Amino acid sequence: KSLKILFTALFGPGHLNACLGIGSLLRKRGHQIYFAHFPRHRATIEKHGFLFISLLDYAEPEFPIVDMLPDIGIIAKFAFERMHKLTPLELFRHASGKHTFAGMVNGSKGENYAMMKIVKEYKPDVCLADYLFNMPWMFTVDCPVIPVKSVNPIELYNGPPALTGCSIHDPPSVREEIEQLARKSELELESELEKLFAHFNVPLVSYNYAQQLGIYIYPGPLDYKELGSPKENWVRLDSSIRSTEISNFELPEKLKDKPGKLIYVSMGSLASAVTELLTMILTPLANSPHRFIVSTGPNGDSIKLYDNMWGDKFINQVALLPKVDLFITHGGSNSLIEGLTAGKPLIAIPQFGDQLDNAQRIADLGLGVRLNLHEFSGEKLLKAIEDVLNDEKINANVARVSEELKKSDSKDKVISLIEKLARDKKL
Numbered sequence: 001k002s003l004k005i006l007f008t009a010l011f012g013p014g015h016l017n018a019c020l021g022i023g024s025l026l027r028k029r030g031h032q033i034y035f036a037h038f039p040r041h042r043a044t045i046e047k048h049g050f051l052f053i054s055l056l057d058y059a060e061p062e063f064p065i066v067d068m069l070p071d072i073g074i075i076a077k078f079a080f081e082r083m084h085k086l087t088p089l090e091l092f093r094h095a096s097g098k099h100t101f102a103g104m105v106n107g108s109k110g111e112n113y114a115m116m117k118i119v120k121e122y123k124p125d126v127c128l129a130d131y132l133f134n135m136p137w138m139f140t141v142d143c144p145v146i147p148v149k150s151v152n153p154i155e156l157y158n159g160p161p162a163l164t165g166c167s168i169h170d171p172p173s174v175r176e177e178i179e180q181l182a183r184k185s186e187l188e189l190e191s192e193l194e195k196l197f198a199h200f201n202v203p204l205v206s207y208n209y210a211q212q213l214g215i216y217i218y219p220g221p222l223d224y225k226e227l228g229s230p231k232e233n234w235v236r237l238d239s240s241i242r243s244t245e246i247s248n249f250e251l252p253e254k255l256k257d258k259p260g261k262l263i264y265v266s267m268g269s270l271a272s273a274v275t276e277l278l279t280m281i282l283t284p285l286a287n288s289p290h291r292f293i294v295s296t297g298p299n300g301d302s303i304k305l306y307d308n309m310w311g312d313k314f315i316n317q318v319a320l321l322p323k324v325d326l327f328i329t330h331g332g333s334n335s336l337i338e339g340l341t342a343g344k345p346l347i348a349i350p351q352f353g354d355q356l357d358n359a360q361r362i363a364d365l366g367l368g369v370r371l372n373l374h375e376f377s378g379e380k381l382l383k384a385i386e387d388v389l390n391d392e393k394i395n396a397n398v399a400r401v402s403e404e405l406k407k408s409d410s411k412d413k414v415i416s417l418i419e420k421l422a423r424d425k426k427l
């Protein structure tokens with residue numbers, strides 16, 4: 001019996017990519033999938049066979065909605081200046097009580113009204129939402145609503161606070177100060193959401209509450225088993241990667257007959273807007289005796305490439321990763337999971353948000369290194385490349401994690417819970 005299932009997510013290509021994976025799994029089981037998102041993503045959504053609903057067609061006139069992705073460079077460039085000039089402690093100091101994603105909350109009202117009308121009109125059996133924080137509509141719609149989480153899930157446990165990138169080796173003394181500042185900023189977020197929920201007359205809930213079922217995507221071998229069990233109603237899916245239409249990534253002729261290993265570079269869908277960041281990374285790599293393929297980002301046509309490099313604004317990462325020896329990443333979750341699935345070690349240069357946590361996780365479990373912008377130099381990057389390429393131990397740890405991901409059954413249990421909740425309205 002067919003269910004009607006509606007997905008939505010924030011503007012981030014990463015959050016949408018997460019849900020596409022889930023939707024694919026459900027479409028095979030015979031369900032009708034709908035996706036409410038922005039027009040940039042109509043092509044990939046319909047290509048996967050999901051029905052596309054534009055949020056913009058359902059805006060309230062007084063509360064308009066905007067795809068943030070093309071305007072994101074203002075915000076990205078600020079974060080970059082800050083991250084480049086300050087340690088993560090100093091960053092949290094000079095952040096007053098500001099949470100990393102509070103200004104996002106004020107302007108969420110448009111998306112909220114939209115989702116109310118869309119759920120009313122399409123009368124779905126269940127909804128799923130990949131969002132950074134819960135939203136009033138998820139508690140006003142007739143059907144149940146499953147938050148999906150693709151960011152680092154350390155926030156689902158009682159442990160190091162999220163978004164700080166604390167290590168498991170961090171002594172008692174150095175974490176103490178960061179957790180105070182982070183407890184504080186979590187309270188600023190709670191107060192921002194109160195206004196949002198107040199506006200729609202909905203009892204405030206915790207920012208990452210799962211009423212009945214929550215799904216977080218993250219590799220089981222990287223999950224935080226040492227902190228105990230995740231929060232309630234929260235289930236894990238080890239990975240959620242969409243299938244690629246391309247299967248063979250042909251290498252560019254520019255790089256044929258050039259020495260060394262093949263290395264992929266991407267600072268993601270969002271931070272790659274900052275040309276200063278890419279320039280800072282690539283300039284030293286000109287002298288690295290390897291071949292680089294580079295995602296250059298939306299402003300990539302104004303980024304200089306050297307003889308050992310080839311790139312374009314957007315690359316088929318899932319098709320390419322199998323062919324590389326190393327992946328220099330920003331520590332985004334989807335890139336982390338695609339990278340590990342393909343069996344490749346990582347050098348993570350974290351830019352914002354959950355990336356600090358993922359970066360530290362990669363370092364703590366010996367899956368690569370963490371190299372921060374503040375302590376960044378050509379000499380250090382070039383040496384991290386040589387070190388990770390030649391570290392037998394790291395290369396074996398990554399093979400093991402890969403093997404677990406490629407055979408995981410986490411999907412089977414998750415699907416059941418979705419179907420069950422959709423039909424019974426209870427777990």
Ligand SMILES: O=c1ccn([C@@H]2O[C@H](COP(=O)(O)OP(=O)(O)O)[C@@H](O)[C@H]2O)c(=O)[nH]1
Nearest residue numbers: 014017268269295314315317332333334335
């Ligand atoms: O040239 C590129 C750059 C990025 N991506 C995709 O964009 C997503 C990036 O998500 P991630 O969580 O790694 O980073 P974020 O976008 O959250 O910064 C992943 O699915 C990548 O496969 C891609 O396909 N090609």
Ligand SMILES: O=C1C[C@@H](c2ccc(O)cc2)Oc2cc(O)cc(O)c21
Nearest residue numbers: 012075076079100101270271352353
């Ligand atoms: O912290 C921020 C603010 C802003 C942002 C984007 C890019 C960047 O380089 C810096 C900040 O938007 C975001 C979007 C996210 O999905 C997750 C985030 O945490 C953030």
